[PDB]
Amino acid sequence: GNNNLAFGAGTDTKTSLQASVSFADLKIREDYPASLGKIRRIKQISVTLPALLGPYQDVQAILSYGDKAGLANGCEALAVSHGMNDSGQFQLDFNDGKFLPFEGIAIDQGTLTLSFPNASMPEKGKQATMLKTLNDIILHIRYTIK
Amino acid sequence: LMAEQAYRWELNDDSARFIKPGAWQGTYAGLLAGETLMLSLAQMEDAHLKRDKRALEVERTVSLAEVYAGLPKDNGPFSLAQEIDKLVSQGSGSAGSGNNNLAFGAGTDTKTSLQASVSFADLKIREDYPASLGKIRRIKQISVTL
Amino acid sequence: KTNLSAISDKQLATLIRKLNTITSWLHTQKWSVFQLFIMTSTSYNKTLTPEIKNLLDTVYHGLQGFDKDKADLLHVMAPYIAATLQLSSENVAHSVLLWADKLQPGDGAMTAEKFWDWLNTKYTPGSSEAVETQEHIVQYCQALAQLEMVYHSTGINENAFRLFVTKPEMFGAATGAAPAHDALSLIMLTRFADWVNALGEKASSVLAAFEANSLTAEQLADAMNLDANLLLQASIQAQNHQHLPPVTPENAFSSWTSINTILQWVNVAQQLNVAPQGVSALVGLDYIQSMKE
Fold first, then answer.
1. Is residue B20 within 8 angstroms of chain C, CB to CB?
2. How far apart are the CA of B33 and the nearest CA of chain A, in angstroms?
3. How far apart are CA B56 and CA B138, in angstroms?
4. CB atoms within 10 A of CB C152
5. How far apart are CA C144 and CA C106, in angstroms?
């Protein structure tokens, strides 16, 4: 289901490796009493990769939310490269009028997926030798209660 | 028309022209002339707000010593170590070919200057990601470490 | 067009009556004959004028970037035409454009689509140049200005003018043809405007009931402060006698022509100070004919 790991489905993704998870399995609504507040919404999500990013070499990876309908254009995904508390943006500012990516997603619905371009070593994929080292993945969730 | 060039460069819509020549009319002493411009700028704003959406981010590191060392062998591949330290010592020379060469400056004030040329066509950065992630890729900044 | 040299006696008598009636109407309206000829003229001068040039510049600047599917061309073009040709209301210009499209003015039949395409392609504002189609454009613009001269001289209200343009049959013009600005139509339009003014404050409801197929004897009798029985009996008498065009119960108050015939019956009755049955008895006294007993 939503919690599998597999090769990309679409015709350009066939070299890409994606890891799918659902918030339903994160079960984050169990972290607090219900009477603290009935809705929980993401304000930001961020990633850390303890990948062995080479000397002036770094991973390319993309993660996206499957709703692709309720959230505005371009906010559906973010990209990660320096890989260490990497919010993805060149600068971030909670005071800016621009929403963050994922800002406003509820914490019980839809799917989160992390994807790696060119993972497949049979294609000599430009991440295969690095990604073969990868052993841990950390997400940092900023979610508000209101 | 300066705001219209800024628009036709923040987006790529070189065809879209919004300022029309009809704003002024000498028959009626040019009365009301500014309110047509006010309407035209309100269109230039609202079409930006609809078209413009969050552009994703990457930071790629590019090493010029690997770009020239990995040069396709139809041009002479060279590491900068053995040509910097002899094009310092001798007043002329070159290595590689075309946009990817290293040579002394051409122009009359550059003849003491050493330049290293590379093309984005050899950086091949469009191969870093699936095409369906987005059809245009644009620099936001470039930076150097020596 | 008809020649006096080869004409029937009855046709000459009819011509005399028409000339006398039109002259009396012009005297009542304080109109010169030349003004009537201008309002009824069909030939148009094919000469560019500064007013027409200004109209073309304004329309071209306003309609630039227009999209055909987004909105109707005529509705978008109406406000600029209203501004350039000295019209009080925008919807008057919309009605005038519909009427002009039905007439297809000029020697080269001109319409909104053709006019817009010519403006888009072959027009360069701010320069005096000779264009082969330019004479047809000038003729079309002149026709529009003339149809303004019609609207302002008649004095008719904006919505009855809209109704006249859209449904000439309601005004009894020949079915399936664009309404004529012929003097014969001008006199009936002036009489209609005068009758609406006579209805006074009731006119707002009477016209709305007239635009639907709703009007009846009682409502119109209340509007004109006449006896309801008088209108009912006038309608009955009009139905019994052979008018041309014929009057039938389902058009007797739907079409303006039937209303005009009924009101003529009422006016003649009140002139003689007798009921409409008196006029019905009078018109039976055709004693100098062989058609009937």
1. yes
2. 34
3. 11
4. 13
5. 11
Closest CA to A105 of A63, A134, A76, A62: A76
Structural determination approach:
cryo-EM
Instruction: Quote the minimal CA–CA distance from C64 to chain B in Å.
Output: 9
Inspect the interface and report whether the beta carbons of B20 and C61 lie closer than 8 Å.
yes
Residue B60 has, within 13 A of its CA and on its CB side, a CA count of 17
Resolution (A): 3.6
Q: Of C214, C217, C250, C210, which Cα lies nearest the Cα of C232? A: C217
C-beta separation of C214 from C205 below 8 A: no
From chain C, the residues in CB contact with B20 under 8 A are: 61, 64-65
Residue A84 to residue C271: CA distance in whole angstroms: 105
Question: Is there a contact between C54 and B27 if contact means CB atoms under 8 Å apart?
Answer: yes
Name subunits touching A (3+ CB pairs < 8 A).
B
Tokens matching residue C173: 């013009």
B22/C64 touch (CB, cutoff 8 Å), yes or no? yes
Locus of tokens 């013009």: C173
Under an 8 A CB cutoff, do B130 and A12 touch?
yes
Tell me the sheet residues that pair with A142.
A44
Closest CA to A26 of A92, A86, A108, A98: A108
Q: What is the dihedral of CA B71, B75, B78, B83, to 10 degrees?
A: -140
d(CA C11, CA C22): 16
B43 in contact with C, Cβ within 8 Å: no
CA distance A99 to B53: 11
Chain C residues with CB inside 8 Å of B27's CB?
54, 57
Residue C78 to chain B, least CA–CA distance (Å): 19
Chains C and A touch (3+ CB pairs under 8 A): no
- Straight-line distance from the first to the last Cα atom of chain C, in angstroms, rounded to the nearest whole number: 38
List the single residue in B with minimal CA-CA distance to A79: B57
Q: In 3-state terms, what secondary structure has residue A138? A: strand
Question: Three-state DSSP class for A101?
Answer: coil
Instruction: Please enumerate in sequence order all residues whose Cβ is within 8 A of that of B139, keeping only pairs 6 or more positions apart, or say none.
Output: none
Residue C208: both structure tokens together: 């709305």
Give the C-alpha separation, C201 to C199, whole Å.
7
Residue for token pair 């004693």: C287
Q: What is the crossing angle of helices C73-84 and C112-122, to 10°?
A: 70
**For the purposes of burial, counting CB atoms within 10 Å of the CB of C25, is it exposed (0-12), middle (13-18) or buried (19 or more)?**
middle
CA-closest candidate to residue C56, choices C32, C36, C38, C83: C83
A56, A90, A98 ranked by CB distance to B57: nearest: A90
Are A117 and B57 inside 8 Å of each other by CB?
A: no
Do A2 and A19 touch, CB atoms closer than 8 A? no
Q: Give A82: exposed, middle or buried? Use CB within 10 Å, 0-12, 13-18, 19+.
A: middle
For residue B25, the chain C residues in CB contact (below 8 A) are: 57
Return the beta strands (E) in C40-169 as ranges.
none
Chain C nearest C-alpha distance from B22 (Å): 6
Q: Which residues have CB under 8 Å from C96's CB, separation 6+?
A: C81, C87, C144, C147, C148, C151, C165
Q: Which residues contact C46 (CB under 8 A, 6 or more apart)?
A: C135, C136, C138, C139
Residue C131, C-beta contacts closer than 8 angstroms, at least 6 positions apart: C122, C123, C137
